[PDB]
Amino acid sequence: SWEVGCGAPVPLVKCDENSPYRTITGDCNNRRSPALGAANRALARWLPAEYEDGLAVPFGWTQRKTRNGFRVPLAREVSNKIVGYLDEEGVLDQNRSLLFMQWGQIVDHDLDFAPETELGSSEHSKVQCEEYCIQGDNCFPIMFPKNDPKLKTQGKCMPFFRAGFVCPTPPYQSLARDQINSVTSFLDASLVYGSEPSLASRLRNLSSPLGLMAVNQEAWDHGLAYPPFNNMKPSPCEFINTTARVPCFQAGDSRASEQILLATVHTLLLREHNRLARELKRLNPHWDGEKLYQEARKILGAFIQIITFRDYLPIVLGSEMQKWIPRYQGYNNSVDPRISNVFTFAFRFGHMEVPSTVSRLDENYQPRGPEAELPLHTLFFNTWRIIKDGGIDPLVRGLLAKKSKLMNQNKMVTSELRNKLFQPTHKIHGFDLAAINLQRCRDHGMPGYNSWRGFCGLSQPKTLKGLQAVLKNKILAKKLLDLYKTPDNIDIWIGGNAEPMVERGRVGPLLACLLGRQFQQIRDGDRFWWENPGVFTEKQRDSLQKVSFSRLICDNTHITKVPLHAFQANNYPHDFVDCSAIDKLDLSPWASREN
Amino acid sequence: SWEVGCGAPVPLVKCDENSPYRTITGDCNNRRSPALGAANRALARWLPAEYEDGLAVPFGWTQRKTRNGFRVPLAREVSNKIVGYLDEEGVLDQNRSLLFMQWGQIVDHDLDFAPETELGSSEHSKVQCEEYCIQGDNCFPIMFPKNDPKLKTQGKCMPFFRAGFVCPTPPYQSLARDQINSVTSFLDASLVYGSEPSLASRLRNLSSPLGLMAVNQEAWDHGLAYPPFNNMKPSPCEFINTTARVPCFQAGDSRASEQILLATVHTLLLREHNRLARELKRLNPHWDGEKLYQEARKILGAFIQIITFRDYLPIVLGSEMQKWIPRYQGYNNSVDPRISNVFTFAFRFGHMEVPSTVSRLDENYQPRGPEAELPLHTLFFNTWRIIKDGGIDPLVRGLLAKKSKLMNQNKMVTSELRNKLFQPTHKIHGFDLAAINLQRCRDHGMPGYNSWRGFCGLSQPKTLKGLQAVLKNKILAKKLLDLYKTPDNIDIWIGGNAEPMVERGRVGPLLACLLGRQFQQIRDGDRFWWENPGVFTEKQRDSLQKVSFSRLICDNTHITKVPLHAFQANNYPHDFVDCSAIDKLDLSPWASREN
Ligand code: HEM
Ligand code: HEM
Ligand SMILES: *[C@@H]1O[C@H](CO)[C@@H](O[C@@H]2O[C@H](CO)[C@@H](O[C@H]3O[C@H](CO)[C@@H](O)[C@H](O)[C@@H]3O)[C@H](O)[C@H]2NC(C)=O)[C@H](O)[C@H]1NC(C)=O
Ligand SMILES: *[C@@H]1O[C@H](CO)[C@@H](O[C@@H]2O[C@H](CO)[C@@H](O[C@H]3O[C@H](CO)[C@@H](O)[C@H](O)[C@@H]3O)[C@H](O)[C@H]2NC(C)=O)[C@H](O)[C@H]1NC(C)=O
Ligand SMILES: *[C@@H]1O[C@H](CO)[C@@H](O[C@@H]2O[C@H](CO)[C@@H](O)[C@H](O)[C@H]2NC(C)=O)[C@H](O)[C@H]1NC(C)=O
Ligand SMILES: *[C@@H]1O[C@H](CO)[C@@H](O[C@@H]2O[C@H](CO)[C@@H](O)[C@H](O)[C@H]2NC(C)=O)[C@H](O)[C@H]1NC(C)=O
Numbered sequence A, B: 001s002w003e004v005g006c007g008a009p010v011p012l013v014k015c016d017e018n019s020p021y022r023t024i025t026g027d028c029n030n031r032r033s034p035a036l037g038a039a040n041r042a043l044a045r046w047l048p049a050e051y052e053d054g055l056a057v058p059f060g061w062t063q064r065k066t067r068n069g070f071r072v073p074l075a076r077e078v079s080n081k082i083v084g085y086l087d088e089e090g091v092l093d094q095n096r097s098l099l100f101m102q103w104g105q106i107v108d109h110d111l112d113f114a115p116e117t118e119l120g121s122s123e124h125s126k127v128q129c130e131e132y133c134i135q136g137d138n139c140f141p142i143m144f145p146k147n148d149p150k151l152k153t154q155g156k157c158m159p160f161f162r163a164g165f166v167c168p169t170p171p172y173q174s175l176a177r178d179q180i181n182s183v184t185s186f187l188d189a190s191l192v193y194g195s196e197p198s199l200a201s202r203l204r205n206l207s208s209p210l211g212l213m214a215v216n217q218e219a220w221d222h223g224l225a226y227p228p229f230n231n232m233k234p235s236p237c238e239f240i241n242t243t244a245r246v247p248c249f250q251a252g253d254s255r256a257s258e259q260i261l262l263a264t265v266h267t268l269l270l271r272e273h274n275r276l277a278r279e280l281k282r283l284n285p286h287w288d289g290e291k292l293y294q295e296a297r298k299i300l301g302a303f304i305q306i307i308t309f310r311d312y313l314p315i316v317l318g319s320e321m322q323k324w325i326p327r328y329q330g331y332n333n334s335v336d337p338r339i340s341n342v343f344t345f346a347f348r349f350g351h352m353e354v355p356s357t358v359s360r361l362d363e364n365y366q367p368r369g370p371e372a373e374l375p376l377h378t379l380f381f382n383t384w385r386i387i388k389d390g391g392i393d394p395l396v397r398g399l400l401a402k403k404s405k406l407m408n409q410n411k412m413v414t415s416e417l418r419n420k421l422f423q424p425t426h427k428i429h430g431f432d433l434a435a436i437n438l439q440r441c442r443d444h445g446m447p448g449y450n451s452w453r454g455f456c457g458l459s460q461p462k463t464l465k466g467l468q469a470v471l472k473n474k475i476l477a478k479k480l481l482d483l484y485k486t487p488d489n490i491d492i493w494i495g496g497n498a499e500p501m502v503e504r505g506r507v508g509p510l511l512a513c514l515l516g517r518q519f520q521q522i523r524d525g526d527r528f529w530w531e532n533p534g535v536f537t538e539k540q541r542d543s544l545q546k547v548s549f550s551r552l553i554c555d556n557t558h559i560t561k562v563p564l565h566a567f568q569a570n571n572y573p574h575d576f577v578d579c580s581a582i583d584k585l586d587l588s589p590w591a592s593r594e595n
């Protein structure tokens, strides 16, 4: 039967039909099922939801209940007992640029986003959670264990809310809970253009009839632009440095400002749009604005798919790609292009690759000034360090020359992320990303480590001597279940990352499986995948295989010497070459001849 | 309506059932229904709650919904246009002592306390209501009209927190909201003995046999008692004058020290008890420390009741007393003894009987001192002016010799109360009792004015020519609805207080009703009312029939000249006689004898 409980707000689009262009909402990619893969629809489930009341309450809610006959360890304890580490000494991946984790957070962002629930924009229930730590309704506090340093400093807990679900979000019911994905499952640069038409036009210079993205009129970077400042007052980017008074940037996506390096690449993508539109305009003079805006948007998306599948995914899945992402072979009209719930917890591995400091290099890539080397922690929702401090050129260099953190079984998440996190809703710099990642698993109802090791075809260990075989490490295998008590209860985020990394990759057996599949599907089920016949022509493609992130730099900044392979470890004199040694993306084929 | 309801936090006890003594909590009075009339229950309702969303948002909080098709007047605006005046001359009630005014406030405090809501305990939210004046779930501001003084001087609005409701304290749903009465509904002098098991005890000197209430050990008044100071740091009493640094008095009821005059009678009471206990002890040598309290505590309540129904009510109601309060025909157990909500707004008529200043007289009832007449406003929460500047003797001569404030359709409430009211919570001296009152009606869900004229079975005016016939004042009737636009929307408090006084009484036909009905009720449903058989003996009564407030003054102060009728006007020295001229209350009939 179909006890299809309740429905949906949803921008209802009617498709065009023959149009050679992508819709904003994400609809119509599919002819037999339109809304399949669009924004604001429940995340998909590869495996049945696992809640305490089997229907919607998270494990670790009604203390006096267990799973599989045990008490689920507090989120914050899992973090301390197993996730943290004090000494940053030589904890850096050595064949991976910082760019390697920045491009990650970007592709993640183009694929998913489960809105937190906040009804409340005047509200004090908003406060019964930050100030009293009382579980009830959407408030699901992250309690602290004994002798947790935070206790003498911030309170009894860390405010935390449940992720919105389909249908409303308020007085919730009926069938097994499924949370929403407010973005589009396609690598369609929807972080640059948006997911709701309403906002996709706000982003637009629509007074000049030459298709351009709206840009800042009050701030500059050597005659180069920054995204437009966001409207809404009580923005956090202002709070950080009350004096400076420079707000967050506004982009197709709403997380663009979390950290100064994220904002930076958001600027390159915004910038590449314009070089492309202007260019096309000059070549196809008769072309009209709307035509420019989308031929550009199309060029750009092709870009995010080629960098992502040619340069980025090989080196994550490593030797497990050929196995999961077979070589492309046409639109498989019948493949779920949607993002599964788990994916959004399996692609969080990146969290473990964020270094504890971001540095600014000066034209010869030398640490510039008295404060070129800052703490990751003083960079969340920070834009003034950009507007009022050298622009983003010195930051882009950092990304090219400095390396990312390497996932170490006994150095998982830097404290800058596990102890001093800034949440846009709050005032302190004392939240924890690891703990959040852990309850958030429970909020969404994920099944356990074993039920997932299963989904992939790997042994489901039960003996502590068994966990050791997989994790290839005793003391980790031990600390782990002195907490969970059984392999069947370990949270996927942690349980997955605990595994050693596959050959020449950056994630193990289970993560490789969950990512591999997901990615293949949004690539085989996307009607606009660039390589699929019709979306572009033989000659347009030929020109597209020559793009590179290195080239992206050369055309939108004043950097001059850059690496051929922006994603691997590169020292400054040798591994760098002046831009004229690198391919250019010939937009000639885009030329349209009249008669 | 015979149905179920929210059974929230209430001290639970077991009815002994044959104890000749009232419980402190008020519980067990009623045999068939225990709770009835108990403290911390929430207020009898005589009419439907009227709220804007039919459940809990005050009328006039959502800035666009109406009442009966019309916008509700700002709380403060009514106060400026109607309630206030600038000449305090000729405003004195020629035939009513200041004491009149004062006994009314004692009888009220014995009957009802609706706690306003929250505190927080280190809160960022008390701050969001006294700075930005932002509306929000517990904070319902009082906004300042345009062209109002307070604007230039205090700010945008003055703080106001809705009053406590019954299932919760914090935030939620389903039934018409009701406020809590934290004091026993019977006239049992519990402003003295308290309404809580735990406080009730602490308030007594258990370090002796003698069964007495504990007195202050740091300061005495000419060899006489004072109540003990209150622990509470961030005390209002000390803030007034830091140099003096004299804390608030601790009494059976919180408000005990809002003003020098109230805190005063609060001592005569306290002293009355210790006397009785002491006295009883010698006539009954073998009694118990414990038997001493409540034989006295019984003697005391009975005292309140008498003065209230016998010298006091007969002059508030006047020719409407027989109509509502017939002669006692004994305990009618089928009568709801609880205080209705409206009573708590009907009784505030006394807010308009407070004169502009408070005096201090020398033993010849001559102004005593360089600063005898003190403007009222510098007396809210004042204690040092007692303990340190004179004693209570000078004040009590004040009450007996000075006059109250006559209610006058033109001068409603003193400016010492309209503009300069002090609240314990906050710092400045610029609040408005009148505006609090009006705001407070909408908070308590008070049905409109007409909905009450009807309830008492009186003409309901619809037109302006209609409202003039009742108020017997054209101009007023006009000012009133140039603001309310319709008789239906006039806030009870004012509308009630607007009607011209009844014969030989001090309230209009409406209030006469409300107040008459309420009082009769707490008297006919109180199993312990004194005239009731069993409660006190035939002889015991015959001796209680002579208690007088003049005698109270005598036995417990060093005043020797007092009037027979302490409630009306009395000029010195013709209306004053020697304390030897007034009766004494013989306790000989309380003499128990062995076999
Ligand atoms: C600071 C934060 C980052 C940089 C130090 C960072 C980085 C990444 C990378 C590199 C990712 C994948 C390659 C990635 C995936 C996802 N993140 Fe994370 N992130 C920072 C801070 C946050 C915060 C706060 C959140 C919200 C967490 C919550 O669940 O409440 C966050 C989330 C995510 C996320 C969820 C997307 C979604 O489903 O809505 C990823 C897939 N990041 N991040
Ligand atoms: C100062 C205050 C007084 C002295 C000038 C004063 C006096 C009286 C008298 C004489 C009353 C009866 C004849 C009387 C009744 C009630 N009051 Fe009032 N009062 C002073 C100050 C206040 C403040 C502040 C309040 C709270 C107002 C609010 O609505 O928030 C107050 C209340 C009341 C009240 C309500 C009891 C209740 O239902 O909770 C009376 C019946 N007074 N007062
Ligand atoms: C708040 O944001 C301010 C930006 O508007 C920032 O002010 C600037 O920072 C420093 C003050 O210490 C000065 O800048 C110089 O600092 C180093 C030397 O330490 C130089 O190498 C740099 O080139 C740079 O010129 C600026 O004078 C100052 N500007 C202003 C207006 O103060 C503050 O640092 C921020 N304050 C906080 C607490 O975050
Ligand atoms: C703060 O409270 C003080 C009382 O605790 C009060 O001071 C009192 O008033 C004056 C001191 O200024 C003294 O009274 C008079 O004393 C002799 C008469 O005997 C006169 O010659 C003096 O000039 C003075 O007028 C009291 O002794 C003094 N009380 C105490 C305990 O010191 C202040 O007036 C109060 N301040 C405010 C702002 O209210
Ligand atoms: C660092 O990573 C690079 C990137 O993969 C490695 O070079 C690749 O090596 C594989 C075979 O192992 C080849 O398919 C490619 O020709 C190489 N790609 C690039 C971009 O160079 C390199 O071997 C790694 N460095 C070390 C020391 O292992
Ligand atoms: C929209 O596009 C127009 C066209 O370029 C922008 O106007 C130019 O702005 C630059 C720098 O701000 C000036 O040097 C030129 O003089 C302007 N050109 C013309 C023809 O007026 C405009 O700034 C853009 N606005 C937004 C919000 O992006």
Ligand SMILES: *[C@@H]1O[C@H](CO)[C@@H](O[C@@H]2O[C@H](CO)[C@@H](O)[C@H](O)[C@H]2NC(C)=O)[C@H](O)[C@H]1NC(C)=O
Pocket: B095, B315, B504, B568, B569
């Ligand atoms: C002041 O008010 C009281 C009560 O209203 C008056 O009391 C009545 O006075 C008249 C004499 O004029 C008689 O009807 C009664 O004997 C009194 N009853 C009471 C309870 O006192 C009082 O007398 C008024 N002042 C004057 C001079 O009448």
Ligand SMILES: *[C@@H]1O[C@H](CO)[C@@H](O[C@@H]2O[C@H](CO)[C@@H](O)[C@H](O)[C@H]2NC(C)=O)[C@H](O)[C@H]1NC(C)=O
Pocket: B205, B207, B208, B209, B210, B212, B213, B214, B215, B216, B217
């Ligand atoms: C509690 O009651 C006792 C019993 O009388 C009080 O004790 C006497 O207090 C007087 C007055 O200060 C002293 O002169 C006596 O010396 C005390 N006698 C005894 C046996 O203690 C006591 O002061 C009272 N305390 C309180 C706080 O009320």
Ligand SMILES: *[C@@H]1O[C@H](CO)[C@@H](O)[C@H](O)[C@H]1NC(C)=O
Pocket: A329, A330, A332, A333, A334, A524
């Ligand atoms: C797509 O589905 C078809 C239909 O069953 C099948 O030929 C094949 O498994 C899929 N093709 C690709 C390229 O994935």
Ligand SMILES: *[C@@H]1O[C@H](CO)[C@@H](O)[C@H](O)[C@H]1NC(C)=O
Pocket: B329, B332, B334, B335
């Ligand atoms: C007792 O109260 C009941 C209920 O209000 C009422 O019927 C009647 O007035 C009273 N009975 C007598 C005999 O007075």
Ligand SMILES: [Ca+2]
Pocket: A110, A111, A183, A184, A185, A186, A187, A188, A189, A190, A191
């Ligand atoms: Ca997308």
Ligand SMILES: [Ca+2]
Pocket: B110, B111, B183, B184, B185, B186, B187, B188, B189, B190, B191
């Ligand atoms: Ca009482």
